[PDB]
Ligand binder design. Sequence first.
Ligand SMILES: [K+]
Ligand SMILES: [K+]
Ligand SMILES: [K+]
Ligand SMILES: [K+]
Ligand SMILES: [Mg+2]
Ligand SMILES: [Mg+2]
Ligand SMILES: [Mg+2]
Ligand SMILES: [Mg+2]
Ligand SMILES: [Mg+2]
Ligand SMILES: [Mg+2]
Ligand SMILES: [Mg+2]
Ligand SMILES: [Mg+2]
Ligand SMILES: [Mg+2]
Ligand SMILES: [Mg+2]
Ligand SMILES: [Mg+2]
Ligand SMILES: [Mg+2]
Ligand SMILES: [Mg+2]
Ligand SMILES: [Mg+2]
Ligand SMILES: [Mg+2]
Ligand SMILES: [Mg+2]
Ligand SMILES: [Mg+2]
Ligand SMILES: [Mg+2]
Ligand SMILES: [Mg+2]
Ligand SMILES: [Mg+2]
Ligand SMILES: [Mg+2]
Ligand SMILES: [Zn+2]
Lengths: 122, 122, 206, 53, 112
Amino acid sequence: MIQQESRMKVADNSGAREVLTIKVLGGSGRKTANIGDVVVCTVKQATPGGVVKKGEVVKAVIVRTKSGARRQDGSYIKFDENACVIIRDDKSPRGTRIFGPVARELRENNFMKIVSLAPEVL
Amino acid sequence: YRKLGRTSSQRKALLRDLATDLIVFERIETTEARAKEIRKVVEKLITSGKKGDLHARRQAAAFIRHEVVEVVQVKNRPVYALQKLFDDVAPRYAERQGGYTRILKKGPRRGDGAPMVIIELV
Amino acid sequence: TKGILGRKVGMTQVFTENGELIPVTVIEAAQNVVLQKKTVETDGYEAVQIGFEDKRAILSNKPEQGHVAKANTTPKRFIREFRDVNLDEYEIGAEVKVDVFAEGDIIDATGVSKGKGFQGVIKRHGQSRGPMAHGSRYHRRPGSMGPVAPNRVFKNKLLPGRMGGEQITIQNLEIVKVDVEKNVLLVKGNVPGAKKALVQIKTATK
Amino acid sequence: AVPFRRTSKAKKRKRRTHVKLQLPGMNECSNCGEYRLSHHVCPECGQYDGKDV
Amino acid sequence: NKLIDEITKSQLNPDVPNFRPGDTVRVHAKVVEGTRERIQLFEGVVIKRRGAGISETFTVRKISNSVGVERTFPVHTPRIAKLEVIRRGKVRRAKLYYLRNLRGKAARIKEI
RNA sequence: UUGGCACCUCGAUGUCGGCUCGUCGCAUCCUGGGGCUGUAGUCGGUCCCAAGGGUUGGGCUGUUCGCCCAUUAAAGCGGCACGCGAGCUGGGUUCAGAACGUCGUGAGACAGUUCGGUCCCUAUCCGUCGCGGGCGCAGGAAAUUUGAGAGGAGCUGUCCUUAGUACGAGAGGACCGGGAUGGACACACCGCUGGUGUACCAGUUGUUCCGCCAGGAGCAUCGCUGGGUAGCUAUGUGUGGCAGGGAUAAACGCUGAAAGCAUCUAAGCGUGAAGCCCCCCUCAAGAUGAGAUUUCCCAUUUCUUCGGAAAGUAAGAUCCCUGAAAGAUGAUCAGGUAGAUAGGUUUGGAGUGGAAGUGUAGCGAUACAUGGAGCGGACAAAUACUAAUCGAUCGAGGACUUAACC
Ligand SMILES: [K+]
Ligand SMILES: [K+]
Ligand SMILES: [K+]
Ligand SMILES: [K+]
Ligand SMILES: [Mg+2]
Ligand SMILES: [Mg+2]
Ligand SMILES: [Mg+2]
Ligand SMILES: [Mg+2]
Ligand SMILES: [Mg+2]
Ligand SMILES: [Mg+2]
Ligand SMILES: [Mg+2]
Ligand SMILES: [Mg+2]
Ligand SMILES: [Mg+2]
Ligand SMILES: [Mg+2]
Ligand SMILES: [Mg+2]
Ligand SMILES: [Mg+2]
Ligand SMILES: [Mg+2]
Ligand SMILES: [Mg+2]
Ligand SMILES: [Mg+2]
Ligand SMILES: [Mg+2]
Ligand SMILES: [Mg+2]
Ligand SMILES: [Mg+2]
Ligand SMILES: [Mg+2]
Ligand SMILES: [Mg+2]
Ligand SMILES: [Mg+2]
Ligand SMILES: [Zn+2]
């Protein structure tokens, strides 16, 4: 349940640390995003020496959310923080490493390098 | 359940009062809504009396008002409503399963047209 | 085409062979009987009149008693016609069990929705509340009736009133399980109406 | 929010068709053949369902 | 309801053990591809067990890689191959929602 | 639109912008159909038919407009007192205060600016949205219904494949078709995730009380706090707009003259749109045109010179009463001893979380056991113990003509 002005920690090695959402993609009045859904963002907090930096607009993927997901088997995955991953025009990251856990909905939506690089997918 | 023009404090007070009064006097003239609630309340007290356990007595004493029915020269010793409940009232219905209380419709009150009833414990 | 009447017992959920989890409404459809068979020559439309529950002869009356005695069965509580149905089936007096359906068979469920009372517009018709601050004294009111020129307000301007009780059909639901002993039918998802409500299940038009 | 016109005698009366009140649902006591309210205790004989009160 | 119970009685897994909130469990859960399966282990603490019958659920909480995770399962899934209770925990609440505003050394549940 | 006129209104027709609610037109923004192309394909330009549905969220400004960021299939133009202030706001503006610059000897003023600044009304009628009562519908009743007519919905992307096929020197890259998955929207429901849950459970502070300990109660926002039943519900779940027929628009054509050819038209045939009528959902016989089917009660007695009446009944229905799945009140629905309608009681159940008392250990706080205990509004099933007692009231006796049956 990520919408405009929502912030998200960043789960990858890129210079971004904290991020704000500009635009949930996927239609006209699409007002919230869930896991596996891309969101146009800005960088509000950066690490120095990073590729990405303060004030840069960039597309990014929601990777873990407090309001999580239900699976067809009747099971729900929830996290204690909302985190994002910054990506290119293809569905690949800009960073090299990925921190913290991750959800299989990305594996479903073909974010496979993210699924791989992350340590624990749940 | 029935609210009776009263907020929770006042309602509970009312029911404690009315129930103690029916245990004491065994017949009272009230309105039919108040009556249709204190049937539940009072009969749930009669169950505690039929059990007679200390635990049931404490549980009831949390509800019944501490006030006197009469005094008895054993030395003048007062009796209380809880004593009348467990020692006098409830033994009367040891063999009766439920339904310790009836309501008889009387007629309307003058100053407010309220529908009044006699409630008594048989 | 094939149909029954039933009572809504409630909701639960069931695991299928895949391990997928599927909510289901339970329909108890006992005592279904065919009472009359309407024709184009007698009436003008072909249909089958089903009666669902047995009830008591003191809650009944002598007219209903006669109509069911022409079927050789007891008075009934719910009686309903089904159309777009073959009449070479359904002999009078016949009992109409849930075994006419099958798992994965696909239906329309028709019933009378639940009763919300007198309601406002934003709940009933989905309108938007006006602000609750910045000076607003307009929160849950309906908005403009319309413009000035008519000297009147148009029909279908939507306003408060009694919300539910309306008849509703839900389409393309799936039958999960059939239990002829319990006279029980399971339906993926929901149906309209409270518990103990009548549901009219029939083969889907599409 | 204010009347544009005065209600006439007829329209007034046409509203007042329904303000009436009903004959009360009473009947005669089996014991005292004297009118009383159904499901209520007779105030004359003080008796109900064949049982004094 | 009794009728519901009578129907859902067949799908009750009796292989599930007695467990409560406070206790650590290991869930051998199935994760399924279009034609394949892996069993993956979710070892963590039970916070809540709500519901009745096959409408009963429990949630198991974990901290993986400095992030808290909270995974809910129906009790009677066939996609739990096994559920191993490890540590039983004295605890005074049925709903352990306080563990979310707590990181380590305060989330510690006392064993018995 | 700028304007012109000054015809209604100065015994008051409230202004810009926004919010709520929309509705209409088409000069169509998108989706749909088509002709021309300086149309290779992709994309496009222009024009015809189409108003079915859809047509974003933010930064600056009081702002409309406009610029910008980011999306979109698209971010339409306009009318309705540039729609809507007895529906809301009241930022701007032109009420009183004060100040700046400027003009004025001055008082004072400025489509110059800035700060600050009271938006009254109990809805009579129509209208609108919902609910009832009365009568009618040539006997009186109970149920099921046709469907005139009327409303609703009507949107759409992305991915795969066809096929890297057609086309193209390459770069690139289809039509038509088949399928999967989404957005927004609508409806329903609460089994799941959650919320709420002021007569469920627990912890706990202060103080007063229950004579004291102990256990509990009152007040302190329900004292605060952690949970939470039913019910209500979304952010949650299920489904939906699928597939389509008939006749058309623009358009393409067949045959065929008028006019020995030609011509899509004149007679006559076919194709042909998200549109029209249907299909799908809902209301609907007050549809006074008052319909139909099934079943039930019967042809009473007084009168009246006729018409016509009243006065007890039948089938049936209600006053009254217990009530919820229902509900503003009515109504509806479930029941009224030929009874499980409600309360209680007994079993359980969710939920809470391990009662009290006793005992043990400990200096004590407290811990442990007895014992998934105790408590448990609305939940479930049984139980007639309590109250639905006994009564009372309304409710037909069925006009005339014709035809066919007879
Ligand atoms: K004027
Ligand atoms: K107005
Ligand atoms: K009962
Ligand atoms: K104890
Ligand atoms: Mg209080
Ligand atoms: Mg809004
Ligand atoms: Mg307010
Ligand atoms: Mg005037
Ligand atoms: Mg005026
Ligand atoms: Mg046009
Ligand atoms: Mg501003
Ligand atoms: Mg703005
Ligand atoms: Mg205006
Ligand atoms: Mg205005
Ligand atoms: Mg006005
Ligand atoms: Mg102002
Ligand atoms: Mg000025
Ligand atoms: Mg100002
Ligand atoms: Mg008003
Ligand atoms: Mg009025
Ligand atoms: Mg729910
Ligand atoms: Mg205290
Ligand atoms: Mg003490
Ligand atoms: Mg005080
Ligand atoms: Mg055609
Ligand atoms: Zn009497």
